[PDB]
Design a protein around this ligand. Structure first.
Ligand SMILES: Nc1nc2c(ncn2[C@@H]2O[C@H](COP(=O)(O)O)[C@@H](O)[C@H]2O)c(=O)[nH]1
Ligand SMILES: Nc1nc2c(ncn2[C@@H]2O[C@H](COP(=O)(O)O)[C@@H](O)[C@H]2O)c(=O)[nH]1
Ligand SMILES: Nc1nc2c(ncn2[C@@H]2O[C@H](COP(=O)(O)O)[C@@H](O)[C@H]2O)c(=O)[nH]1
Ligand SMILES: Nc1nc2c(ncn2[C@@H]2O[C@H](COP(=O)(O)O)[C@@H](O)[C@H]2O)c(=O)[nH]1
Ligand SMILES: Nc1nc2c(ncn2[C@@H]2O[C@H](COP(=O)(O)O)[C@@H](O)[C@H]2O)c(=O)[nH]1
Ligand SMILES: Nc1nc2c(ncn2[C@@H]2O[C@H](COP(=O)(O)O)[C@@H](O)[C@H]2O)c(=O)[nH]1
Ligand SMILES: Nc1nc2c(ncn2[C@@H]2O[C@H](COP(=O)(O)O)[C@@H](O)[C@H]2O)c(=O)[nH]1
Ligand SMILES: Nc1nc2c(ncn2[C@@H]2O[C@H](COP(=O)(O)O)[C@@H](O)[C@H]2O)c(=O)[nH]1
Ligand SMILES: Nc1nc2c(ncn2[C@@H]2O[C@H](COP(=O)(O)O)[C@@H](O)[C@H]2O)c(=O)[nH]1
Ligand SMILES: Nc1nc2c(ncn2[C@@H]2O[C@H](COP(=O)(O)O)[C@@H](O)[C@H]2O)c(=O)[nH]1
Ligand SMILES: Nc1nc2c(ncn2[C@@H]2O[C@H](COP(=O)(O)O)[C@@H](O)[C@H]2O)c(=O)[nH]1
Ligand SMILES: Nc1nc2c(ncn2[C@@H]2O[C@H](COP(=O)(O)O)[C@@H](O)[C@H]2O)c(=O)[nH]1
Ligand SMILES: Nc1nc2c(ncn2[C@@H]2O[C@H](COP(=O)(O)O)[C@@H](O)[C@H]2O)c(=O)[nH]1
Ligand SMILES: Nc1nc2c(ncn2[C@@H]2O[C@H](COP(=O)(O)O)[C@@H](O)[C@H]2O)c(=O)[nH]1
Ligand SMILES: Nc1nc2c(ncn2[C@@H]2O[C@H](COP(=O)(O)O)[C@@H](O)[C@H]2O)c(=O)[nH]1
Ligand SMILES: Nc1nc2c(ncn2[C@@H]2O[C@H](COP(=O)(O)O)[C@@H](O)[C@H]2O)c(=O)[nH]1
Ligand SMILES: [Mg+2]
Ligand SMILES: [Mg+2]
Ligand SMILES: [Mg+2]
Ligand SMILES: [Mg+2]
Ligand SMILES: [Mg+2]
Ligand SMILES: [Mg+2]
Ligand SMILES: [Mg+2]
Ligand SMILES: [Mg+2]
Ligand SMILES: [Mg+2]
Ligand SMILES: [Mg+2]
Ligand SMILES: [Mg+2]
Ligand SMILES: [Mg+2]
Ligand SMILES: [Mg+2]
Ligand SMILES: [Mg+2]
Ligand SMILES: [Mg+2]
Ligand SMILES: [Mg+2]
Lengths: 205, 205, 205, 205, 205, 205, 205, 206
């Protein structure tokens, strides 16, 4: 599978004149106010990926952010709640047309309690995802080949996953439920940035 | 406190030609598929209330449901997640223009972890709510005077509470956050009815 | 006020030619293999009670046991799971026609999570039960007046509670459910005596 | 080895003129009000199995339901609490002559705390059960061969387990205990459907 | 009423030519290696008490220690596990003829789960113990009158408790059980001093 | 009680030519990145207090900040870990000569596990602190009298508590331990601001 | 490894004219009042073992009990708290001269938290113990070869462990501590049988 | 199978430790210094060799080792030094006050994980596999096994390399002064443990 590695930004959007784009990020951790965005990965669904190294203190990624703000393009994530938070924190733009495979799994894979990307890829696609590079130094000046291949593999399958989940959402008649969850997801990420990351805002207590 | 007690439905909407109505419910418990709607309470905010006794197996309430369907009329609840579920389950209409004082409290009363109606009324209004009649037989053929007064007092204050929360939401610049939460609330209630009542659909796990 | 205090057994069944008898016990604790039966209390529901001091090592009580054996007489308990175990363990007979007000509460008072005898008397009868003497030396040769009145008060109201609960079970169409629970309750008590007291036999784990 | 796959129902009862039938189900999850019945599996104990695909929306399965309601045929389950609830919810008939290998294990295999089907088959029968297909799309129009073999294996051994457990129940003199448990189990499943699925109805609290 | 306050040690043992002496201690906390012994209290059971202030760094108290070493006098404590440890740690002598009212309560008051001194005095003696001064500066040069009265109250009643507990231990035939617990209790206190204070040495894990 | 209420800053330092100043803050909550500083309170120990209302968005307070950075003036706090973080976060200066009565309590009141300000003032000074205004709108344009008196109450006694705690630290020879804890406290507060507020940095895990 | 299997009792004591005997039991579970003694295993330390099948209802085993009652012979167990309980419950004699390798491990292997027999055998002897047969039907009429070898292996090594543990206890100067623990252990087992099996009798609460 | 010098009681001299930083670890009979004695002290200069020092029961002095511990010009490197500092100070009466802890360093830099054990850190940063099998063993044995000795040495052979990497990360994320304050308080943290506060986060609200 072809992986294109970039510094800072995509050089252009030639490969992203499409209706939906798979998005993932790597960071120094789970706390966007502390842990910087280090890598953004994209795939058009054609078996190739773009891996974009983000510099310390980088405030701009023009072509990437054009995709993120384009209401005609659905941004596909796995657990987008996190990626939306770090992307909006880093570049100041909250994507608002999204699809999340973790939310979709929670709404359709009711026969299991494991909604991780690895389990979903294994079941739906007979694809083995390795999480070994997940805990590595994503801020390294030069990413290792293992790191680059891991980062790319997290976006290579989200299109195929979205297609299968859309089928299940239609079959079980939960399309409008999923859509409302995806519509609120960017606000759920904003709530995390604002200080409510540990609070289920809809809970009784 | 004037309290108009009705059987089944409001006689007409003469007292509710208004832009926002306070709504509450009494039931036989917290599980809408098991525990029937017993009472619906309404207030226009003029210090009076309508207490509507709902019969076992009752399927319609035309005037009430017209109110719940009116996009021009904001339905105010305290923890509307529950009331929206039981009203939609009982009469078949999910209100879609709502305001919840519990969500508003969680977004503004950041200096406490107590977001109950009693606490909010004591703090914001120096008004003492008693919960003694909360655990009583709300399916009784004839409600007691104590029950009627308790049921009415849960809607008598929601207009004033909402006015104060709107002030705080404006002060701390959280108006669009609250709006997104209220927009998703009916679907959060629907998710409860559909079987996800114990699941934070947005959580990692 | 009329509390008849007996040593060992009822003198006769003259006061219990009735359809249902309220039963309760006091012990040295919650473990029937260690904690002996100390007192058995009985009421016909007429506002009087019979309090029977059971001696250490007592193996028989023919009149009481005739009541417990009599299929035409329903034995009413609050949380009979306990009283059935210690009665069967002490006298060798397991009553098989029973009504439990705690199980009835759990099947009807779905609007609360408190199903203790004190809360139920307070809510259903506006009758105030004290538990101050519950923790006392029930094996003392001479029971105190406080002890005797406490023991009597635990049976004086079970008829009235059963009457209200049977209406509720009829209103919510759960009579057959309650009956099955009461039918298994003697076996749930045997399960406790046999060594499964800490196991919900129907749980997945 | 020999698995007969059917759409909708058994074609007739020619293979089930027997004293006891092994039964199992596959579903979209553990909540019958949300998660539909997808497969019912049957075995006469002769080392063959019938695997019946249940359509979305299917309200009748007349031959299967004849078996389920025939009081002269014991239905054998592993953790029948679940299967009874989904079968009664789907087709409206609660089987009432049952044997549950999980309850029987909890009454006899007191030397272990593991009462799952895989653990019981390994110990009692030296049969290796794989649970890999347990979390799969049981609503798929075409079940995979691995799904079909998994579903069949859950009923192929229940007669042999029952025979062994009956020997242990007799040896430890717990036959009447188990019988009472099996007699209540259909009402325990009914309690689950009615809204008490999280409540041990016999517990103190 | 009569409380004799001493610096360092009793002047003599003239008041303690008796079969049993009540003993208690006050400290700066629960960790004997950090928190010094501040006060030792004694009573003969005649309704008077001796309150002995222990100085920082004090290593001997010959009269007190002669009492504690005397095999012919039973030392009565409430929860002697603690007192034994700080006494042995401070003066180098571990008493080995003891009675503990907390252990005795746990072997006899099986009808409650509260085995604190206040609860036991309330139930068995109708005596009100206040623990208000328990958290106070016990190392103060001058103990307050409330501290002095509190420290004495902790030994004034132990003989009367021991007498009641010995009757219960006899009635329930647990005298040899209790004797074995008391015999091990000095070694349990030693175990705490040696570093096993958080470990139940007899537990499986 | 003379309470001087100010907008924005002290008008001058004429009352704070002293070696130690008592400091406290009120906020909209416990998260300094979300919850703004609303009130700063100061006392010289003379039984009077200054209560300074801090405006939304206020970036400087030159007289208050002069005291905070003055290395010759010890800043006394109760649980200064919090106040230090919100003061540094708001005005940009981390005080580094501090005394915390909560840390001092944990190092000296080893005979209790309650180290809150209310409990400490009760025990050490016989002063009753009310917490009723703690959960109130500290951002209000006009503070109520009850709010103002509460805010002043949290600084009026800190000098007296520090004097007592210093006596105890000397008595138990923990002065250098206390000093090292106070020296690290500003870095502990910084760690909180940087994103480690939920982490004990010195724990094994 | 020679393993002598017997029905009911040792035929004679010819192999046990020794100072110390290794003892273990197998049962139907961990609750002596419910789960019967099925097997008793003995070793003299010579690398051979005796495995004694205990029949259901068996009330005597004279030669075995002679060994258990003999104060000149130390009975070695691993976690004898359990074996002492079930032996005394079954044959009515509590062994009173014992050594427990789990208590010894807890007093000497302070560099670990794993005190199970497998861990101890592997570390101290480089001997691999398998627990695969631990959960099997020990009441089976004919024990499997695997069961017989498992049962023997639990006593084959206890002499060698005791010798090492005694060396550690001497080295760390804990011999009198261990001896007091061993002296109390039969009463600890008695406490279990009498109803205190879930209670640390020496705990504060 | 590296060069491991085994000594009884103390280093014979300081010839191998005229350096600015020394890697330090200990083995004991357990985690409670008042009960569980110091049994082994291990040292490395970072050159791929280690000294393993058996401490006798009751041993009160270790002059050469303690000279290193109190030398303010030498940084003592530990993994989770909170523990080693407590047992060393309890045994020989000197608390080292110039230290670097790789566990604190990991908690301040490897924010992308929740696993800060030495085995994980060595695997990730150095592709070095550490075995913990000998951790639970009789460290007070008169003669240590070969496996024990190699385990003890391996716990110090890599700390210099870890410290170098962590110092780069601390610089990169601008947390050097944060780390320095943590290391300066760590000896007092270990002292608090000895004094009776081992179970208490002294900076917590409750
Ligand atoms: N602290 C912590 N961070 C994680 C964990 N899992 C992932 N991360 C962080 O969050 C990012 C998520 O990336 P992904 O999981 O898509 O590889 C990682 O680059 C890593 O920095 C975890 O379990 N703990
Ligand atoms: N917010 C949050 N993220 C987690 C948690 N556990 C794992 N993660 C991270 O969230 C991402 C998605 O996890 P997955 O859904 O693939 O298990 C991964 O980077 C994973 O390491 C958690 O408990 N909370
Ligand atoms: N089971 C249960 N039901 C409650 C509880 N609190 C409130 N409810 C139910 O919720 C309904 C509405 O609550 P309310 O508006 O009275 O606060 C009540 O009529 C009552 O049936 C509770 O704590 N437990
Ligand atoms: N869903 C849910 N409702 C609760 C819970 N606890 C209390 N309630 C009910 O929810 C309603 C609102 O609670 P409040 O916010 O007034 O405390 C009341 O009827 C209260 O009894 C809970 O844990 N879950
Ligand atoms: N240990 C313990 N025993 C109790 C408790 N409550 C009741 N008991 C025991 O169980 C008996 C039940 O009697 P009742 O609750 O009807 O008064 C009492 O006589 C007493 O011996 C309890 O909370 N703890
Ligand atoms: N079996 C059992 N009984 C309890 C428990 N807690 C309290 N009890 C006792 O059970 C009896 C019934 O309590 P009630 O139903 O009146 O709350 C009382 O004696 C009470 O003290 C418990 O957790 N388990
Ligand atoms: N959510 C969830 N569903 C399960 C789990 N295990 C089994 N199921 C559901 O229960 C059905 C029956 O389980 P089975 O008989 O295959 O063990 C399965 O088809 C599946 O839908 C589980 O762990 N979680
Ligand atoms: N109700 C319930 N079902 C469970 C739970 N855990 C597993 N199950 C499912 O229930 C079924 C019982 O199978 P077992 O675990 O007894 O072999 C399986 O489908 C299993 O996955 C649980 O905690 N509760
Ligand atoms: N840390 C702490 N120490 C206590 C507590 N209760 C009692 N103590 C200490 O233990 C000593 C025992 O005294 P007594 O409880 O007999 O008055 C007291 O002097 C006090 O130092 C407690 O709850 N926490
Ligand atoms: N170990 C321990 N001792 C306590 C605790 N609380 C009080 N104590 C001590 O135990 C004795 C009596 O406690 P009581 O049984 O009255 O609660 C007193 O010496 C008291 O200081 C505790 O939580 N743990
Ligand atoms: N969320 C929350 N905030 C608190 C709590 N206690 C105090 N605060 C906040 O912390 C500030 C500290 O004020 P103080 O505790 O000194 O009165 C308060 O003004 C309030 O905003 C609490 O328990 N929960
Ligand atoms: N950081 C933190 N502060 C708390 C917590 N609980 C209460 N507080 C607040 O911290 C302040 C000091 O608490 P105090 O020591 O006076 O109890 C008060 O404002 C109190 O409400 C907590 O769990 N964590
Ligand atoms: N219920 C249960 N029983 C056990 C367990 N482990 C051992 N047993 C029982 O305890 C007896 C003695 O254990 P063993 O000496 O073989 O380790 C066994 O024969 C078995 O009946 C367990 O984990 N759970
Ligand atoms: N009483 C008790 N026994 C246990 C527990 N866990 C395991 N056992 C059983 O106790 C015996 C000794 O366990 P070991 O010390 O070898 O781990 C084994 O038969 C084991 O299965 C437990 O938590 N409590
Ligand atoms: N009790 C206990 N002690 C440990 C544990 N891990 C390490 N130790 C002790 O701590 C010492 C130092 O650990 P090391 O530096 O070998 O990792 C060991 O020699 C051992 O005594 C543990 O998990 N539990
Ligand atoms: N204080 C403490 N030490 C531990 C704990 N768990 C493991 N240790 C020991 O602390 C040392 C460091 O562990 P590591 O950081 O390498 O996981 C090892 O000797 C390890 O065995 C714990 O929970 N607390
Ligand atoms: Mg990701
Ligand atoms: Mg990724
Ligand atoms: Mg309501
Ligand atoms: Mg209401
Ligand atoms: Mg009762
Ligand atoms: Mg009673
Ligand atoms: Mg199944
Ligand atoms: Mg199945
Ligand atoms: Mg005391
Ligand atoms: Mg005292
Ligand atoms: Mg404050
Ligand atoms: Mg304050
Ligand atoms: Mg064993
Ligand atoms: Mg064994
Ligand atoms: Mg170490
Ligand atoms: Mg080591």
């Amino acid at each position: 599978t072809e992986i294109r590695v970039h510094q800072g930004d995509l050089p252009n959007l030639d490969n992203y004149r499409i209706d939906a784009v798979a998005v993932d990020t790597e960071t120094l951790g789970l706390q966007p106010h502390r842990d910087r965005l280090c890598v953004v990965q994209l795939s058009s669904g054609d078996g190739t990926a773009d891996v974009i190294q983000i510099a310390k203190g980088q405030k701009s990624a023009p072509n990437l952010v054009r995709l993120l703000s384009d209401r005609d393009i659905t941004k596909i994530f796995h657990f987008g709640r996190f990626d939306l938070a770090i992307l909006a924190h880093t570049f100041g733009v909250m994507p608002d047309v999204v699809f999340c495979t973790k939310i979709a799994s929670k709404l359709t894979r009711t026969y299991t309690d494991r909604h991780g990307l690895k389990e979903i890829c294994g079941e739906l696609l007979n694809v083995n995802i390795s999480k070994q590079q997940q805990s590595s130094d994503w801020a390294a000046e030069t990413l290792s080949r293992a790191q680059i291949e891991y980062a790319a593999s997290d976006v290579l399958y989200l299109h195929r996953l979205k297609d299968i989940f859309e089928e299940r959402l239609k079959r079980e008649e939960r399309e409008s439920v999923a859509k409302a969850c995806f519509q609120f997801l960017p606000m759920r990420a904003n709530l995390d940035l604002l200080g409510w990351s540990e609070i289920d805002i809809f809970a009784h207590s």
